[PDB]
Amino acid sequence: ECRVLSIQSHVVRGYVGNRAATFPLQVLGFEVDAVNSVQFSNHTGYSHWKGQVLNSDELQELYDGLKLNHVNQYDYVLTGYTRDKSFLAMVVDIVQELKQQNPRLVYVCDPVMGDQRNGEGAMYVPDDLLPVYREKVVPVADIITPNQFEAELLTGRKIHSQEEALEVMDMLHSMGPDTVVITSSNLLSPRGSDYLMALGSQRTRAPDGSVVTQRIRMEMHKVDAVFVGTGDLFAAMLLAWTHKHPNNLKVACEKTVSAMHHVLQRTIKCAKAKSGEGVKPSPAQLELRMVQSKKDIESPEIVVQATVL
Ligand SMILES: CC[C@H](CO)Nc1nc(NCc2ccccc2)c2ncn(C(C)C)c2n1
Secondary structure (H helix, E strand, O other): OOEEEEEEEEEOOOOOOHHHHHHHHHHOOOEEEEEEEEEEOOOOOOOOOOEEEOOHHHHHHHHHHHHHOOOOOOOOEEEOOOOOHHHHHHHHHHHHHHHHHOOOOOEEEOOOOOOOOOOOOOOOOOHHHHHHHHHHHOOOOOEEOOOHHHHHHHHOOOOOOHHHHHHHHHHHHOOOOOOEEEOOOOOOOOOOOOOEEOEEEOOEOOOOOOOEOOEEOEEEOOOOOOOOOHHHHHHHHHHHHHHHOOOOHHHHHHHHHHHHHHHHHHHHHHHHOOOOOOOOOOHHHHOOOOOOOHHHHHOOOOOOOEOOO
């Protein structure tokens, strides 16, 4: 389709934020407009890093710039990782106005707060953004893609099983999103810890008989290491697919997830090819071979399966 306004980080080297969401959304042909929330030499997982960040007024400035020219009409809107309470507030205001300009304006929001290894408490962002995502952000998004950990901070409920997972999504939907996709979880699955499971559900409509929800469950094949930027590349590719497949939360994750295995085992492939068998690949070597996946980002050779409910 077309016009995406993506507000995310930018790194000179590597793939994270806009660097991870642009090329994709581009070769799949979207007119991606990018607002760089920060500009760092590289992501903060490298030993060193240097750069500047955009404050709230600077973001404001760029947005004014677009109003004045009346070119501020967008179809879908994308956002991810932020550290600033205020930058996230502003971002909310901006997404509001853009929905009047275009009624079918879907705000796709990956609520990046932190991570899980196995049941817990603190995350990656200060704890003071938690409220903003819950009270202000999530009520306006139309597609969110949280961790199991994050889905729990949002709903404030701990996920212990599968159907406890499904009822944390429902408290999600009701929050606003006619789509929720738990990109990853601690939940063992019908296939072994070798794998990794994610969850998906989409609250739809038909006049009365006013209720439809759809659920599924992909299990893609875990990979031995620490990548950074995977969730940006995920949410980016979701949008694409969930673009073509408006009532098919099923059909979507399916191609997205599929593309994800290629990109990573090519990354992992080259990744080790730079220590072969012998030592751990450095942050540098793990960076996504997004370019080389020129060909797969493109054509998901559908390698995964999923069960409705
Ligand atoms: C904080 C987690 C990670 C550390 O391994 N580093 C990092 N660093 C990033 N660099 C940009 C940045 C630096 C400082 C503050 C805010 C953003 C970054 N951008 C998007 N993402 C993630 C959510 C995919 C980013 N992640």
